[PDB]
Amino acid sequence: GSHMEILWNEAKAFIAECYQELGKEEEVKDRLDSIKSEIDRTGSYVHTKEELEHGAKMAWRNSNRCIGRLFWNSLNVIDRRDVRTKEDVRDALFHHIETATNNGKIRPSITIFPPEEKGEKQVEIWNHQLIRYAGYEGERIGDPASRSLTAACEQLGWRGERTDFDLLPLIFRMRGDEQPVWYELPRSLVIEVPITHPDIEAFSDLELKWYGVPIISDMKLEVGGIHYNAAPFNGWYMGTEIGARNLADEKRYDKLKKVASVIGISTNYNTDLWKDQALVELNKAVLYSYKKQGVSIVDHHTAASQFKRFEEQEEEAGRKLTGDWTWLIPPISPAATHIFHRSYDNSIVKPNYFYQDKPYE
Amino acid sequence: GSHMEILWNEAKAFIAECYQELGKEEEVKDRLDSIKSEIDRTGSYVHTKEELEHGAKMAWRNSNRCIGRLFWNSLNVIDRRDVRTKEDVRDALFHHIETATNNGKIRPSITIFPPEEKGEKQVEIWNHQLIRYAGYEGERIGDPASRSLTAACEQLGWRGERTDFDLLPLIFRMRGDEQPVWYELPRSLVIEVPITHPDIEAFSDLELKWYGVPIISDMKLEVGGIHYNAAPFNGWYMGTEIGARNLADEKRYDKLKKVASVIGISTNYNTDLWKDQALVELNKAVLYSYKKQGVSIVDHHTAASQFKRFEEQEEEAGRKLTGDWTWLIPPISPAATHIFHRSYDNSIVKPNYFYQDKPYE
Numbered sequence A, B: 001g002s003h004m005e006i007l008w009n010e011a012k013a014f015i016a017e018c019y020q021e022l023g024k025e026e027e028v029k030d031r032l033d034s035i036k037s038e039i040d041r042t043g044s045y046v047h048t049k050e051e052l053e054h055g056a057k058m059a060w061r062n063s064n065r066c067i068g069r070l071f072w073n074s075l076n077v078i079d080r081r082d083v084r085t086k087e088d089v090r091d092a093l094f095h096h097i098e099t100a101t102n103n104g105k106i107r108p109s110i111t112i113f114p115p116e117e118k119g120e121k122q123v124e125i126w127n128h129q130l131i132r133y134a135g136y137e138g139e140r141i142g143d144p145a146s147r148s149l150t151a152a153c154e155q156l157g158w159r160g161e162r163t164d165f166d167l168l169p170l171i172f173r174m175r176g177d178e179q180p181v182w183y184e185l186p187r188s189l190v191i192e193v194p195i196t197h198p199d200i201e202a203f204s205d206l207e208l209k210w211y212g213v214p215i216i217s218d219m220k221l222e223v224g225g226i227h228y229n230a231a232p233f234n235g236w237y238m239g240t241e242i243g244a245r246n247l248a249d250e251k252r253y254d255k256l257k258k259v260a261s262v263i264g265i266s267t268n269y270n271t272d273l274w275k276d277q278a279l280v281e282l283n284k285a286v287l288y289s290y291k292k293q294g295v296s297i298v299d300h301h302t303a304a305s306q307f308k309r310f311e312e313q314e315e316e317a318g319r320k321l322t323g324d325w326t327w328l329i330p331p332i333s334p335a336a337t338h339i340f341h342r343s344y345d346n347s348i349v350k351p352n353y354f355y356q357d358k359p360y361e
């Protein structure tokens, strides 16, 4: 009753806006009647290959927390709404990793799976990111942020080698199944980058490494009332995400003290700013390492500069700019970027990507 | 009519809360009747030396943008509500600088001047901070943030030597006067710190320096409906305010490129993170310099650690904590502090310090 009312309302708003941007104003009338009859006949409607493709781009454009939005219209949209089996999903996910990686020259992509029908999911992806390291406890091993999912995977028959960098397997559930299935990732498909420093040879003693491509797989893509709970996407890393957060946070890998040791500085006094110096050297190491192995990565200054250009384009296009200052500012030298010196409207505009409840935990 | 209604309401709320904290609950009844008759007789009321003293502390405690709130109850309250002449104000301001500086061992203080009566100010301070450098244009000279006030001072007969560090004179207006008066600051009263690096000798070639004590003099102190438009206060500097903002912002002294030059690094590539390395070395220089000259200063890690202790105390006292995340996080290595990893309620609670319109511009 009310669900068939919200759907139609969001559909009218989307088709008008989407079609307007595609230089498509006259086809709006004939497309909305087809949609009205489809919602009455079945209870939902199916997007065309052009609608969801541009819808996915519009969603990226509206992502307040993303600094890489300048590249919104270049998104590689892979249509996999035809998957029916677990093998279809597994291969589609494998394909995503492969085509997105592109031997290092990362391609911003998104794979669209079947959306929810009567509020129930067709495909449910458990992984936060397709490629991600496991986490364990006694004393900290691996990535702490992955603990709950690791435990869930282990309750399904999977077992990790308990190193600091164990690749979590792909884990997802199909409609009709009570428990999810899992598949170990083929190593030939995952690029990993060992972290080394351009001037400091001892840096390799830390034996740090990270994976080349971040593929968020647990967010819901909302386009015109249609909920794509399963639609993995990826960009390339901004150095700061790895060297200032993933490897730096006390609740993550917490490596600043060990970094200070190999670069030769004391951790005795905050006034020496050892954490700041450690952060700079660790972050320099990350950018140098990815570049050296031929894997795309961007530094926060270049990223902010690209984002400034995005702000200008949005103003030129006539569109209102939305953003979350607290996430847009880089965790290192934020005042050195223009983002810090201005304010953003944190309003939510659809289409967009949303958080959804974790099936585990 | 309505003004005599807002005043009484804010007075009841303040006396109850203030007296409650002072272990003063029974004197509330007899204090509020005196205040009610005072508002009817004159149109306002006069705080006791205990009320405004604690009121000034409570205002600091409620300052969402301040990271140094752990020290709220140690504030040195100087009562100068007895000033009538421009000389009285001048000497009180001179006294503030002297006693607050305390030969380097900075004392957090605030001088209270007569508040507003029927909405009109008794004393109006034009300076943003009592001690501050001038700014000029053709090509940038001095501090750009001081340009408008410098121009106003120059329209009153004052002339600066046009160096990058010219001390602005004290400039304030008395009730009954159309234009403000000004007084050059006695150099013997102002401590300045030349910036040098502990390991890099060439750093002195930049010839940078900053003043020892930040004394905000243009904010309005609101306590129980009483508006103290003139109530200069000071703490000690957090290194980041000088080396990451005052000397780093492109719109301020913009020294990062020159810093990179003396420390021996190239400014060619963002991927080398030269701005970040320059920031670390410039900030290390600031902390080392102040410490060397015996002037109080705190690094951002120690400051955040002290602020964490403040959060705990507020929870122990039963008080709701308020804060502005965007200002609490340091401009350098914010993710290395606990502040970055949590959220704050940016609600305004009185008493507090507020912004007021600038008489110049």
Ligand code: HEM
Pocket: A056, A059, A060, A063, A065, A066, A067, A068, A069, A071, A075, A108, A109, A110, A233, A234, A235, A236, A237, A238, A241, A298, A303, A327, A353
């Ligand atoms: C092209 C390269 C890209 C860069 C450099 C980039 C960068 C960023 C960064 C730095 C963040 C903050 C991440 C964090 O702090 O955890 C972020 C968040 C986000 N980005 Fe991107 N991004 C890129 C591509 C994409 C694409 C392809 C999409 C969608 C189609 C997208 C959607 C989002 C969303 C929704 C968020 C919020 C994620 C969350 O809340 O965890 N981004 N991005």
Ligand code: HEM
Pocket: B056, B059, B060, B063, B065, B066, B067, B068, B069, B071, B075, B108, B109, B110, B233, B234, B235, B236, B237, B238, B241, B298, B303, B327, B353
């Ligand atoms: C004890 C040492 C103190 C430290 C370390 C400290 C530190 C800070 C810092 C770092 C800021 C941000 C400044 C900026 O970004 O421009 C700030 C803001 C502020 N502080 Fe303090 N503070 C201290 C004392 C005080 C005192 C004594 C008061 C009041 C009685 C106070 C009131 C405030 C207020 C109202 C703000 C906001 C100022 C504005 O909006 O420009 N602080 N403080």
Ligand SMILES: C[C@H](O)[C@H](O)[C@H]1CNC2=NC(N)=NC(=O)C2=N1
Pocket: A326, A327, A328, B340, B341, B342, B343
């Ligand atoms: C509460 C606050 O919004 C969070 O701690 C933020 C702040 N900024 C952030 N920035 C980025 N890049 N990633 C985050 O997870 C993040 N989290």
Ligand SMILES: C[C@H](O)[C@H](O)[C@H]1CNC2=NC(N)=NC(=O)C2=N1
Pocket: A340, A341, A342, A343, B326, B327, B328
């Ligand atoms: C719009 C935004 O609130 C301002 O640019 C902020 C952010 N954080 C800040 N932090 C500090 N310490 N001082 C500032 O002036 C400041 N300004």
Ligand SMILES: N=C(NO)NCCC[C@H](N)C(=O)O
Pocket: A068, A129, A214, A216, A234, A235, A236, A237, A238, A241, A242, A246
């Ligand atoms: N830069 C991107 N996408 O392109 N980031 C997505 C989130 C990545 C996450 N912050 C991580 O470190 O794994």
Ligand SMILES: N=C(NO)NCCC[C@H](N)C(=O)O
Pocket: B068, B129, B214, B216, B234, B235, B236, B237, B238, B241, B242, B246
């Ligand atoms: N730390 C304090 N007070 O104690 N700061 C007040 C504002 C100072 C200002 N940010 C400056 O650099 O001049």
